[PDB]
Structure formats: structure tokens, C-alpha cells
Design a protein around this ligand. Structure first.
Ligand code: CL
Ligand code: CL
Ligand code: GD
Ligand code: GD
Ligand code: GD
Ligand code: GD
Ligand code: GD
Ligand code: GD
Ligand code: GD
Ligand code: GD
Ligand code: GD
Ligand code: GD
Ligand code: GD
Ligand code: GD
Length: 258
């Protein structure tokens, strides 16, 4: 027919067309999270919005390299160097450094997380921005692994509301990737979620990430409709806009018919 019929039962993901000045990269907000608290981040409500009820520590904007790979220090015979988790051994040492004198179980201060000076051993962060598909089709987002707890949400009224990136978080627990740390046990690696996206619309994107102890890890990728994979560096794909709650036409509830 003259027009497409639309995704079945309004199934299209909501997207946005913000009219303001586009900024490269995502905004990162940092919130307090307690060292060795292995229970708070196991709740869907906390990971969707509850994190923002705790003290906000600070923020950084314009971040395009969004994967997390935080390594604790090994205080070694030859100085203090970050230890890759797979190189830690015993009680404890780091391969190529010998025995480490420092505890794995205390807070450590570092700018490793997006240049913001904080405790990557124990913190919760929220990444917000808009994903711009250059190609129409199915996109598969993935976390290679999650240490400790994380979610990824895509879509208007799922990640956040259109033209309202900076507002308090919305309550949706309809996660695109549920990487919430289970009450007992661990999640597989390569946890994934797929979204069908229309080229040139801006899709709200939220990642909430938490760590309680020592190493923190969140390697983020997306597989494009063309079968190629973008990992870590999302430059050219992720953007921010200042709130404009007055832009009436900003929400596109169904990009398949717009
Ligand atoms: Cl270090
Ligand atoms: Cl060694
Ligand atoms: Gd990176
Ligand atoms: Gd980097
Ligand atoms: Gd890092
Ligand atoms: Gd690593
Ligand atoms: Gd870094
Ligand atoms: Gd680094
Ligand atoms: Gd880095
Ligand atoms: Gd909404
Ligand atoms: Gd951890
Ligand atoms: Gd594929
Ligand atoms: Gd890097
Ligand atoms: Gd703003």
C-alpha cells in the first residue's frame, strides 16, 4: 500500500528528534555505593532509578568511550601498578609483579572511570545519551561480562523521556539488557538485547553500572545491521542534548510510520 502498515500492535521502540544543539558523547552521573554491599544492586528498582536516591558524587559529559575496565592497584616490590584480574593469584600477587602488600577489600581512589576522581571499587554510575542508527535494522547490544551489576535500556519511555535526558530517572524496568547481579550466583558472559532501529532517529540510551568490591568490568558492544561490531568506542553513534521539555514534537512513538 501507499504506506507501511506499522510494527504489529505498536511494537516499535519509541525514538526522538531533538531540535537543539547536538553534543558528541554520553553524560555520566556518579552516585554513592557502599563498599562490599552485594545486595543493593540486585534489585531492579535500584538499578532502574533507585541509584539516584543516593548521594550524587559528580558527573562528566561528552563521553564516547564507554566500556569499563577497572583494575585495583598491586603495591609491589617495584612500585604500585594496576593488576589485570586474570593476572591476580594466591593471597595475593600479580603476575610479573610478585606479591602485593595491599588489601583487595578496601576502597581505592582513581580517575579510571571517565577521568572522574572517585572510588571505582564501590560506585554506581548512569550513562545517558541518544543512539543514532546510521542504518535501519536490528542492532544487538551486549555486555561481554558484568562485574558487578548492570542494565542497558534503549527507547523513549524506557531509557528516559525524549528531550528530557537530564531529568531524574524514569521507573521503567523493561531493560534491553538485564545484567543485574543475581541474589545467588553469576550471569553468563555475552548477555545481549536486540532493538530494531530506524536510521536517523535518536534513541534514548541508558546504562546503569555498579561495583561493590575491587575489579569492575563492563565491556559494551553493539552489532550493526550490516553484521559489523562496534566495541567500547561509540564515537559517531552517541550524542547528548540539553533538556528541552517545551519541544512538543520531540517524541516519535512509532518511527516505522513517521
Ligand atoms: Cl594502580
Ligand atoms: Cl609474579
Ligand atoms: Gd575504552
Ligand atoms: Gd580510551
Ligand atoms: Gd580503564
Ligand atoms: Gd581486564
Ligand atoms: Gd579510563
Ligand atoms: Gd586504562
Ligand atoms: Gd581507558
Ligand atoms: Gd512516556
Ligand atoms: Gd567487582
Ligand atoms: Gd550476525
Ligand atoms: Gd582503552
Ligand atoms: Gd543542561
Amino acid at each position: 500500500g501507499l504506506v507501511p502498515r506499522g510494527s504489529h500492535m505498536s511494537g516499535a521502540t519509541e525514538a526522538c528528534l531533538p531540535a537543539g544543539q547536538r553534543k558528541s558523547g554520553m553524560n555520566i552521573n556518579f552516585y554513592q555505593y557502599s563498599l562490599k554491599d552485594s545486595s543493593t544492586y540486585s534489585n531492579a528498582a535500584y538499578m532502574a532509578y533507585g541509584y539516584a536516591s543516593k548521594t550524587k558524587l559528580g558527573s562528566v559529559g561528552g563521553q564516547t568511550d564507554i566500556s569499563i575496565d577497572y583494575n585495583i592497584p598491586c603495591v609491589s616490590s617495584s612500585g604500585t601498578f594496576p593488576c589485570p584480574q586474570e593476572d591476580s593469584y594466591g593471597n595475593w600477587g600479580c603476575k610479573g609483579m610478585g606479591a602485593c602488600s595491599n588489601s583487595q577489600g578496601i576502597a581505592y581512589w582513581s580517575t579510571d572511570l571517565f577521568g572522574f576522581y572517585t572510588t571505582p571499587t564501590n560506585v554506581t554510575l548512569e550513562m545517558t545519551g541518544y543512539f543514532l542508527p546510521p542504518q535501519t535494522g536490528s542492532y544487538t547490544f551486549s555486555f561481554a561480562t558484568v562485574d558487578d551489576s548492570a542494565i542497558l535500556s534503549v527507547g523513549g519511555s524506557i531509557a528516559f523521556e525524549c528531550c528530557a535526558q537530564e531529568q531524574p530517572p524514569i521507573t521503567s524496568t523493561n531493560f534491553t539488557i538485564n545484567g543485574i547481579k543475581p541474589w545467588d550466583g553469576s550471569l553468563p558472559d555475552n548477555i545481549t538485547g536486540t532493538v530494531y532501529m530506524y536510521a536517523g532517529y535518536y534513541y534514548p540510551l541508558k546504562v546503569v553500572y555498579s561495583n561493590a568490591v575491587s575489579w569492575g568490568t563492563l565491556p559494551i558492544s553493539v552489532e550493526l545491521p550490516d553484521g559489523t561490531t562496534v566495541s567500547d568506542n561509540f564515537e559517531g553513534y552517541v550524542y547528548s542534548f540539553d533538556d528541552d521539555l517545551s519541544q512538543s514534537n520531540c517524541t516519535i512513538p512509532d518511527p516505522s510510520i513517521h
